[PDB]
Design a protein around this ligand. Sequence first.
Ligand code: HEM
Ligand code: HEM
Ligand code: MJM
Lengths: 72, 22, 372, 99, 59, 48, 89
Amino acid sequence: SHTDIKVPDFSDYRRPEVLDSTKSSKESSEARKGFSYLVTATTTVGVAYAAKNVVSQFVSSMSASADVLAMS
Amino acid sequence: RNWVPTAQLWGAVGAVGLVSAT
Amino acid sequence: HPLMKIVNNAFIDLPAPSNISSWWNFGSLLGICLILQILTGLFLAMHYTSDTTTAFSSVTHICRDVNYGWIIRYMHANGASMFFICLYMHVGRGLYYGSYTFLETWNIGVILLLTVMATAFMGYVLPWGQMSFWGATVITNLLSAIPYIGTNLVEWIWGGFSVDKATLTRFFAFHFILPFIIMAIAMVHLLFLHETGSNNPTGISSDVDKIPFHPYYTIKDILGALLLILALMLLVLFAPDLLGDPDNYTPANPLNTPPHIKPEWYFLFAYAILRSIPNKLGGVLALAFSILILALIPLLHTSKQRSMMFRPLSQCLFWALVADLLTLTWIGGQPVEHPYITIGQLASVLYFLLILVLMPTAGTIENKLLKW
Amino acid sequence: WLEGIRKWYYNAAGFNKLGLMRDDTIHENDDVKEAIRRLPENLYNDRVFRIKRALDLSMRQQILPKEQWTKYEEDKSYLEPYLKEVIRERKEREEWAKK
Amino acid sequence: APTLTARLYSLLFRRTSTFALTIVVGALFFERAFDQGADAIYEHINEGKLWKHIKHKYE
Amino acid sequence: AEPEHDHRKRMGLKMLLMMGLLLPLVYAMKRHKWSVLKSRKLAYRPPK
Amino acid sequence: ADLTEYLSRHYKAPRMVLAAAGGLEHRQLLDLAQKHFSGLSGTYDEDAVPTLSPCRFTGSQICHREDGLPLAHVAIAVEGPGWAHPDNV
Ligand code: HEM
Ligand code: HEM
Ligand SMILES: CC1=C(c2ccc(Oc3ccccc3)cc2)C(=O)C2CCCCC2=N1
């Protein structure tokens, strides 16, 4: 039958916060999301710091150089 | 109706942005 | 909506294979290199001037006086090398995993290689240092070895009887534009790839197990982009003059040849194959065939297995061909004296022997071992 | 005589560590595609899974446990008899087209 | 009990609207914090050798 | 020959620090996303 | 042995309800239940009383790939409220 199909054990791959199969995940869910989405946000902040500097440097080359500012 | 707090929050997000690089 | 649908079928829900290693990341990096060279390059050309009177002064003007001009220059100069590292990975991947079986994709590739070689060669002339001038004077003059019209072909290319102001100014025009032809060709490189789908490391049809490009390979190619950026910025910020030659900081002088004359590192294997043969024309044809033999690779294929993953003899000969290329790259860097002449001679024959003779025979034996 | 080194090469090839038979790794072309199309439901749906599992292994950079590896003695050549016929029919069509 | 990271999720970045406001403001602060820190680290690494260290000298 | 020398090494420090920060964070996002496939389990169930 | 033990455990009075609906008098139903159903046992042996442990909801997928069948059936759901929750409305 198709009722012979049970889902294999993911206890190896699971997080610690959802291992107890007698426990409602909802209390941990917000923490589990908050952890992963923090990584993403921290990455975006770190790139945003870089991107700002890279762009600003190219913009500054297009601006007035040292030798023109000197003899102005 | 419902996009007023969202568009205000995105209005803030965009605003600080122009402060962000400049 | 007609554009988004192109970008969907290109990058969003293109069915990629599930099991693609980091050797497929180099394609996206080559585009990132091409875009990096274009964006850095544009900003260099905003200050650079292509006259022999001003060319050197302008490059130094960029480094010294243009605000953050140095960081843009060395990102261009080392990015050029990173483009080439990425290329040699991207070409080798296809050699190993049998991706050359997408004939048109591969043959467009072979074009893409040659255009970048021309781009980077002409780019190197631009700053007008000794090695730039003398690199051009050596490498261009090779064409005079052609049977009946080479001597004319060279003077036409130069715009005179030597490398000069006529050559430099057109070399700038050719540099600034050929990258866009490369990008145009590259979109056709991709166009044939979607027709044929993408290959995986096993060399086995992965229609049974596909996954959407986004979000899997988007975040993977992003990860790989940072590693390319890291590798660039390590070179730019800690070792900008490492891969580059010192003599190019000496302003060009046609009345004084530097002693150890050579191309950049990414042509040294081909330079070594040229030096191997003593006859001039033969040296040029071997130099040419060293690159163009890539086009014969899909015809030289013999094994009933597509990928080298399940092919020991081929794997060893492939990894021999890599080592042999690294030998030729080394030899091309060294001067033409003993013992390097004989090492270069053997390495050069070994190169064509691995491709033409051995690796096909290996595949044929590998078949006979498995009852094919 | 050299069944030994044939068996060595089989193990050295390594597709057996992924749980693939020899004919799962054959490079597709017009003949092979046609032979694979001619396969009956069972052998087709099996090679589907054998390949689907082998790719899933290749993704994770792993191989099967040593007992689950394919055996040189128990490596069935399921695709050959069909592929031989497809090739022989193509050769016939070419030999007829010659005249 | 509301946890450490869940308290961030719940009020700071559940919405994608506030997600960006957090990133922007966090990046605004990060820039000041990191630059200042890494400047000071580089300046302590290279003590006495830069102009700002020997500027009082000739001024 | 190299007036940029000081400034360039400061960018160097900041680059190494920032790459040190980002590479694991990005790799973590990659692993977080690919997890779905990397843990998956294939079951073959033909009929008789 | 399993069926009878499952019956002896679970089929009992405090865990059961007798419902009725139609043209009938509540008093009469209660007399019938008193006369026939009051023979059921009313508590346990001091153990064997199973009480429901809460079930872990797991966000996850199952993909029975079968091209031979004519139409794909998909069922997607998030964790529910439970019988008690007013939110149900
Ligand atoms: C595939 C793309 C490109 C490659 C591989 C490439 C390669 C090179 C190389 C190797 C140099 C010499 C660097 C040095 O040692 O100084 C150079 C210089 C230059 N390139 Fe490019 N380039 C590319 C694209 C561009 C583009 C698109 C432009 C303009 C739009 C540009 C403008 C320049 C300029 C002005 C110089 C001279 C300044 C200098 O020497 O740094 N390049 N290029
Ligand atoms: C500007 C240079 C190049 C760009 C931008 C480019 C771009 C791409 C991209 C984006 C892909 C798909 C991603 C991948 O699978 O790696 C790809 C694949 C491929 N390219 Fe290139 N390419 C370049 C050079 C070359 C060269 C020089 C060759 C051959 C001489 C070549 C042959 C191929 C092949 C055979 C594939 C198929 C990969 C597979 O097996 O899945 N490419 N290329
Ligand atoms: C089409 C395609 C791309 C790809 C994605 C974006 C591209 O365009 C870009 C060019 C420059 C920068 C970023 C993206 C080009 C190719 C890949 O990476 C891969 C990687 C492995 C799956 C097959 C595949 N297919």
